[PDB]
């Protein structure tokens, strides 16, 4: 049959993202709006810095700013933890270590508020170098394809993942961002604990030519594989 959580993602779902961030004492907020079509693993989102100029590079916030919109192929529907936790949602926590630089720690709640899928995030960044690639804005407005390997955490009744993001550096070379992730359901209801698999993601970053605020337009495709 069609899972309860799965039925909530059959059409185009509107998305709201809210982030409050603090990086080396530099406080900022981001609001995002768009839509998710999980049948096609498709996300279209636009993000606005509501406090003015973003004090970090936009590409460093992409993983933080809704894996419930991944396309799980038919043979893999049983492994979709993210949709199975809905509508009550899940807590998504990360540490992101920027090699030779500081770290982000993030706590988010991903859940339905009526028809809207909400990602509400707190971000804390510490130990960044003022002349580093992040606070120095040396990352290209760019993003690579990747595979995120997802594994069950039965003890916490959720999942974990660790992956590397590579951010192109303007001179040359790559800035590594080491992600450690844990997701736990918010509700007491049953959820799907998946077999080992991975999410294949491609991301295109762009600008709205009519937008004067510091912003990022994100087009993303996410597909489950590996079984």
Q: Residue ranges of the alpha helices (H) in the chain?
A: 4-7, 81-84
Q: Regarding the domain delimited by 14-225, which CATH topology (the fold level of the hierarchy) does it fall under? A: Green Fluorescent Protein (2.40.155)
- CA distance linking residue 205 with residue 141, whole number of Å: 7
Q: What are phi and psi of 140, to 5 degrees?
A: -65, 145
Domain ranges, ordered by start, for the chain:
14-225
Closest to 164 in 3D by CA, of 152, 151, 175, 172:
175
By three-state DSSP, how is residue 41 classified? coil
76 touches 169 (CB < 8 A): no
Closest to 117 in 3D by CA, of 172, 192, 215, 38:
38
119 touches 18 (CB < 8 A): yes
76 touches 55 (CB < 8 A): no
Closest to 143 in 3D by CA, of 61, 71, 39:
61
| CB neighbourhood size of 146 (10 A) | 17
Q: Any idea what the Cα angle at residue 143 is, between residues 133 and 202, rounded to 5°?
A: 155
Q: What are phi and psi of 76, to 5 degrees?
A: -115, 0
167 touches 174 (CB < 8 A): yes
């Amino acid at each position: 049959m069609v899972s309860k959580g799965e039925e909530l993602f059959t059409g185009v779902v509107p998305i709201l993202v809210e982030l409050d961030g603090d990086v080396n004492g530099h406080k900022f907020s981001v609001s995002g709006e768009g839509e998710g079509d999980a049948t096609y693993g498709k996300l279209t989102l636009k993000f606005i810095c509501t406090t003015g100029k973003l004090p970090v590079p936009w590409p460093t916030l992409v993983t933080t700013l809704v894996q419930c919109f991944a396309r799980y192929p038919d043979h893999m529907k049983q492994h979709d933890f993210f949709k199975s936790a809905m509508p009550e949602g899940y807590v998504q926590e990360r540490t992101i270590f920027f090699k030779d630089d500081g770290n982000y720690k993030t706590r988010a709640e991903v859940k339905f508020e009526g028809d809207t899928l909400v990602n509400r995030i707190e971000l804390k960044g510490i130990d960044f170098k003022e002349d580093g690639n992040i606070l120095g804005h040396k990352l290209e407005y760019n993003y690579f394809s990747d595979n995120v390997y997802i594994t069950a955490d039965k003890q916490k009744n959720g999942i974990k993942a660790n992956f590397k993001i590579r951010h192109n550096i303007e001179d040359g070379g790559v800035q590594l961002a080491d992600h450690y992730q844990q997701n736990t359901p918010i509700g007491d209801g049953p959820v799907l604990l998946p077999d080992n698999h991975y999410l294949s993601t491609q991301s295109k970053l762009s600008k709205d030519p009519n937008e004067k605020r510091d912003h990022m337009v994100l087009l993303e495709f996410v597909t489950a594989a590996g079984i």
